[PDB]
Amino acid sequence: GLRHTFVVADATLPDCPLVYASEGFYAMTGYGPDEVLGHNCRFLQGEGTDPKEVQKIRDAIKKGEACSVRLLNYRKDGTPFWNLLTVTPIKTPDGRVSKFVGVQVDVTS
Numbered sequence: 001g002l003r004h005t006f007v008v009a010d011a012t013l014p015d016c017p018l019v020y021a022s023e024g025f026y027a028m029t030g031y032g033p034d035e036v037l038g039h040n041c042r043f044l045q046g047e048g049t050d051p052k053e054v055q056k057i058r059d060a061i062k063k064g065e066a067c068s069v070r071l072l073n074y075r076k077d078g079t080p081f082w083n084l085l086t087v088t089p090i091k092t093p094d095g096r097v098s099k100f101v102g103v104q105v106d107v108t109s
């Protein structure tokens with residue numbers, strides 16, 4: 001299938017730090033687990049990351065709904081790429097949000 005990357009953020013902590021990233025996520029962005037694990041996914045954003053689309057993620061997280069956005073992310077080396085971002089809330093049986101999963105597709109074409 002199409003190439004994609006996959007990360008998991010812990011929603012129990014207030015700022016959703018990532019706790020697991022697929023091997024491709026490190027290889028696509030250029031960051032390593034020592035620079036990724038325990039940080040919010042915001043370190044990928046830069047000068048051209050549309051602030052309106054970022055708000056959609058922030059809001060859908062606070063409300064606990066899924067959302068899908070198109071952001072401008074930046075590799076470790078500074079070069080940019082276009083990130084199709086889909087976030088999904090994983091709930092416990094008591095309706096509470098426990099984890100947030102992300103699927104990032106480099107859609108620079």
Ligand SMILES: *[C@@]12=NC3=[C]C([C])=C([C])[C]=C3N([C][C]([O])[C]([O])[C]([O])[C]OP([O])([O])=O)C1=NC(=O)[N]C2=O
Pocket residue numbers: 007008009016040041042044045054055057058061071073083085087088100101102103104
């Ligand atoms: C990021 N992927 C990503 C994956 C998950 C599971 C979640 C919950 C969020 C992201 N983000 C967004 C980031 O963590 C944050 O929520 C946003 O910056 C909005 O909040 P702020 O505080 O900044 O207003 C992802 N952002 C990216 O840029 N790239 C991803 O791959």
